[PDB]
Amino acid sequence: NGKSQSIIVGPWGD
Amino acid sequence: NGKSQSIIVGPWGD
Amino acid sequence: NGKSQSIIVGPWGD
Amino acid sequence: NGKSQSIIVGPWGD
Amino acid sequence: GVTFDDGAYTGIREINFEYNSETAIGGLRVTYDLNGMPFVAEDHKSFITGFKPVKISLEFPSEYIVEVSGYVGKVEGYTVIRSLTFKTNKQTYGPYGVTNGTPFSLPIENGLIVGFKGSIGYWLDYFSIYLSL
Amino acid sequence: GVTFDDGAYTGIREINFEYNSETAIGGLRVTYDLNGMPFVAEDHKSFITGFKPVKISLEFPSEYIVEVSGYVGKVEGYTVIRSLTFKTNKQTYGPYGVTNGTPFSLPIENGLIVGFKGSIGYWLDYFSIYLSL
Amino acid sequence: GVTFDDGAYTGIREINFEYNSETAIGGLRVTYDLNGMPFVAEDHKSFITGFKPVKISLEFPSEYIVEVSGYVGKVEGYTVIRSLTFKTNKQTYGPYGVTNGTPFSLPIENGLIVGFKGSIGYWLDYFSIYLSL
Amino acid sequence: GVTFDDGAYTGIREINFEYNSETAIGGLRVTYDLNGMPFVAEDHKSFITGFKPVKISLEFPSEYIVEVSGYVGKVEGYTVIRSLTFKTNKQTYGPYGVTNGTPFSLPIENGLIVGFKGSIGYWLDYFSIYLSL
Numbered sequence: 001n002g003k004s005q006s007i008i009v010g011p012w013g014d
Numbered sequence: 015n016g017k018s019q020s021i022i023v024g025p026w027g028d
Numbered sequence: 029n030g031k032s033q034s035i036i037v038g039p040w041g042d
Numbered sequence: 043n044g045k046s047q048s049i050i051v052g053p054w055g056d
Numbered sequence: 057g058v059t060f061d062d063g064a065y066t067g068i069r070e071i072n073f074e075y076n077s078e079t080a081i082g083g084l085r086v087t088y089d090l091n092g093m094p095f096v097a098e099d100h101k102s103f104i105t106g107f108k109p110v111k112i113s114l115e116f117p118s119e120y121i122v123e124v125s126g127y128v129g130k131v132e133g134y135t136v137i138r139s140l141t142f143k144t145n146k147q148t149y150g151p152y153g154v155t156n157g158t159p160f161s162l163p164i165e166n167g168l169i170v171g172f173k174g175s176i177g178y179w180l181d182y183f184s185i186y187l188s189l
Numbered sequence: 190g191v192t193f194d195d196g197a198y199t200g201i202r203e204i205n206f207e208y209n210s211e212t213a214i215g216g217l218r219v220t221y222d223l224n225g226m227p228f229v230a231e232d233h234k235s236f237i238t239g240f241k242p243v244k245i246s247l248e249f250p251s252e253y254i255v256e257v258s259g260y261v262g263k264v265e266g267y268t269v270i271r272s273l274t275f276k277t278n279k280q281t282y283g284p285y286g287v288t289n290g291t292p293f294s295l296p297i298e299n300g301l302i303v304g305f306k307g308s309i310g311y312w313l314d315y316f317s318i319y320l321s322l
Numbered sequence: 323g324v325t326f327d328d329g330a331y332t333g334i335r336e337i338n339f340e341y342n343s344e345t346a347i348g349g350l351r352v353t354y355d356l357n358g359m360p361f362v363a364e365d366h367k368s369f370i371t372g373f374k375p376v377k378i379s380l381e382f383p384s385e386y387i388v389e390v391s392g393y394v395g396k397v398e399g400y401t402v403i404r405s406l407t408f409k410t411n412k413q414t415y416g417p418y419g420v421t422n423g424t425p426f427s428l429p430i431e432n433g434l435i436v437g438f439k440g441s442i443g444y445w446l447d448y449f450s451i452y453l454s455l
Numbered sequence: 456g457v458t459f460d461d462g463a464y465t466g467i468r469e470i471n472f473e474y475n476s477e478t479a480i481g482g483l484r485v486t487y488d489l490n491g492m493p494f495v496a497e498d499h500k501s502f503i504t505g506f507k508p509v510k511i512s513l514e515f516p517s518e519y520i521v522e523v524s525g526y527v528g529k530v531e532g533y534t535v536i537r538s539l540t541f542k543t544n545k546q547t548y549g550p551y552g553v554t555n556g557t558p559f560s561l562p563i564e565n566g567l568i569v570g571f572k573g574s575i576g577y578w579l580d581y582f583s584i585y586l587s588l
C-alpha cells in the first residue's frame with residue numbers, strides 16, 4: 001500500500 | 015562512497 | 029515474509 | 043551524524 | 057528560482073500544482089502523510105500568476121503513485137518542467153501543461169514517493185523525488 | 190495503559206520523561222527532528238503524578254543516541270519499565286529510576302532511532318523503537 | 323577471538339552453531355538467502371572442540387526470526403555469549419547453552435535479520451545483527 | 456526475451472555489456488560488490504552476436520554511478536534499449552549504441568544502484584534498477 005514501512009525493534013517491558 | 019550501508023544493532027556479549 | 033524488500037525503479041524500455 | 047538519510051532521485055528539469 | 061526541500065514523510069495524500077498550457081508548471085504544494093496524519097507542507101509559489109490549478113486527492117493509503125513523468129523544455133530561455141503526469145495504481149492524472157521538449161519518466165516497480173524538493177521561480181525549474189519503502 | 194505510536198521521523202532532538210526512584214518510569218514526550226525542523230510529538234502522560242522529570246536535550250545533529258538500556262520489573266503486579274539509560278556518542282544520561290529486575294539493552298552499531306511507540310498507564314508498560322538509516 | 327562479518331543478505335535460511343551446556347556458545351555458520359538462492363557463509367570456528375551442534379533449518383521464506391535472546395556471562399574469565407534462543411513466527415528454537423548471567427533480547431516488531439557479525443575465540447565473544455526491510 | 460533479475464547486493468564493481476552502433480544494446484553481465492567481495496552475477500546473453508563489448512571497471516568504492524541514461528527505440532519492430540550512458544562521480548562512460556528515439560534518465564542525488572533486472576532477447580528489451588542506501 002501507500003504507507004511507508006519502518007524497522008521496529010522491541011517491545012521491551014512485556 | 016559506493017558501499018551500501020546497513021542498520022546494525024549490537025554487539026551483545028561485551 | 030522472510031524476503032528482504034528493495035526499492036526498484038523502472039522499467040525503461042517498454 | 044544524527045540526521046536520517048534518504049534515497050533521492052533526480053533532479054529532472056536541468 | 058527559490059529552492060525548497062520538503063524532506064521525507066511516510067506517504068502522499070494530495071498534490072496541488074499550477075500549470076499553463078502555453079508555458080509550464082508553476083507552483084506546487086504537497087500534503088503528505090506523516091505517520092497516519094495529513095501533513096500539509098509549505099506552498100512553493102510561482103513568482104507569477106495566470107495558471108490553472110489542479111488538485112490531485114489520492115485515496116491514501118490504497119492509492120499511491122507508481123510513476124511520475126513529464127516534459128522538460130525552455131520557456132523564455134529557462135529550462136523548466138513544462139508538463140507532469142502522475143500515474144497511480146488506480147488511475148492517471150494528466151498530462152498537465154505543455155507536452156513538448158525532452159521527456160523524462162520515473163516508473164516505480166517497488167517503493168514509494170515520500171517527499172519532493174526542487175526550485176520554483178516563474179516556473180518549476182527542476183525537482184527531485186524522495187524514495188523509500 | 191493507553192497505547193501510543195509517534196511513528197517515524199528523521200532524528201531525535203529532545204526526550205522528556207518522568208521517573209520515580211521507588212517505582213518506575215512514568216510519562217514521556219519526544220521532540221523529534223522532522224526534516225531539519227523540531228517536531229514536538231504528543232505527550233504520553235502517566236495516569237498519576239509524583240514523578241521527577243528529566244529533560245534530555247541532544248545537540249542535534251552532532252549528538253545522537255547510540256544505546257538505550259534499562260530494567261524491567263513489577264510494580265503493583267504490573268510488568269513495567271523501571272529504569273532507562275540513554276547513551277549518546279557524547280555522553281550518558283542516566284540511569285533514571287529503579288535499576289532492579291531484568292535488564293535489556295539496544296546498542297546501535299549503525300543506524301538511528303527515529304521514533305518511539307508503546308503504552309503508558311500508571312507507568313511505562315513497554316515500548317518499541319523505530320530504526321532507520 | 324577472530325572477528326568476522328558476514329555482511330548483509332536478503333534473508334536467513336539456516337543457522338548452525340555449537341553449544342556446551344557447561345560453558346558457552348561455540349562456532350557458527352549461517353546459510354543466508356541471497357536473492358532467492360541459498361548462500362552458505364563462512365564457518366566461524368571455535369578455537370576448540372567438545373561442543374554439541376544444532377542446525378536450525380528455517381522454512382524460508384514463510385518462516386523468519388522474530389526474536390533473538392540469550393545470556394552473557396564469564397567462562398574462564400572471558401565475557402561471552404553463553405546461551406541463545408531463536409524465536410520465529412512458527413516456533414522457538416532453544417534455549418541452547420547455559421542460561422545463566424546477564425540476559426539480552428532483540429525482539430523484532432517489523433523488519434528482518436539479514437546478517438551477522440562478531441567474534442569467536444574459544445567461545446562466541448559477542449555478535450551484532452544486521453536489520454533491514 | 457529471457458527475463459533476469461540479479462537481485463540486490465552492496466554495490467557495483469564492474470559492468471560489461473554489448474552494443475551495436477546500428478541496432479541496440481545486447482547482453483550484459485554485472486560484477487557486484489557483495490559485502491566487500493567481488494560477486495560476478497549471471498551473464499545475460501543476447502540471442503545473437505555481432506556486438507562490440509564494453510567493460511566498465513569502477514574504482515570501487517571511491518567511484519560509483521550517479522546517473523544512468525539512454526535511448527529507447529524500435530529495432531525490427533521491438534521496443535528496446537538502444538543506447539546507454541553511465542555517469543559516475545569520477546567520469547562518464549558512453550554513450551554506447553544508437554542515441555536515437557525516446558530518452559530516459561535516472562540521476563541519483565543520494566543512494567546507490569545495488570542491482571539490475573530486466574529482459575534480453577536479440578537486444579536488451581528493458582531493465583529496472585535496485586536502489587538502496
Ligand SMILES: CC(=O)N[C@@H]1[C@@H](O[C@@H]2O[C@H](CO)[C@H](O)[C@H](O)[C@H]2O)[C@@H](O)[C@@H](CO)O[C@H]1O
Binds near residue numbers: 058134177
Ligand atoms: C532570481 C530568480 O530566482 N530568478 C528565477 C530564475 O533563476 C535563475 O535561473 C538561472 C538559470 O541559468 C540560475 O539558476 C539562477 O540561480 C536563478 O536565479 C528561474 O527560476 C526562472 C524560471 O523559473 O525564474 C526566475 O524568476
Ligand SMILES: CC(=O)N[C@@H]1[C@@H](O[C@@H]2O[C@H](CO)[C@H](O)[C@H](O)[C@H]2O)[C@@H](O)[C@@H](CO)O[C@H]1O
Binds near residue numbers: 190236269311312314
Ligand atoms: C485501564 C488501564 O490502562 N490500566 C493500566 C494497566 O493496563 C492493564 O494492564 C494489563 C496487564 O495485564 C492489560 O495489558 C490491560 O490491557 C491494561 O489495561 C497498566 O498499564 C498499569 C501499569 O502501568 O496501569 C493501569 O492504569
Ligand SMILES: CC(=O)N[C@@H]1[C@@H](O[C@@H]2O[C@H](CO)[C@H](O)[C@H](O)[C@H]2O)[C@@H](O)[C@@H](CO)O[C@H]1O
Binds near residue numbers: 323444446
Ligand atoms: C588470541 C585470541 O583471540 N584469544 C581469544 C580471546 O580474545 C582475547 O579476549 C580479550 C578480552 O579481554 C581481548 O578482546 C583480545 O583482543 C582477545 O584476543 C577470547 O576470544 C577468548 C574467549 O572466546 O578466546 C581466546 O582464544
Ligand SMILES: CC(=O)N[C@@H]1[C@@H](O[C@@H]2O[C@H](CO)[C@H](O)[C@H](O)[C@H]2O)[C@@H](O)[C@@H](CO)O[C@H]1O
Binds near residue numbers: 535578580
Ligand atoms: C521468444 C523471445 O524471447 N523473443 C524475443 C522477443 O520477446 C518477445 O517480445 C514480445 C514483445 O511484443 C513479447 O514481450 C514476448 O513475450 C517476447 O517473447 C524480444 O525480446 C526480441 C527483441 O529483443 O527478441 C526476441 O528474440
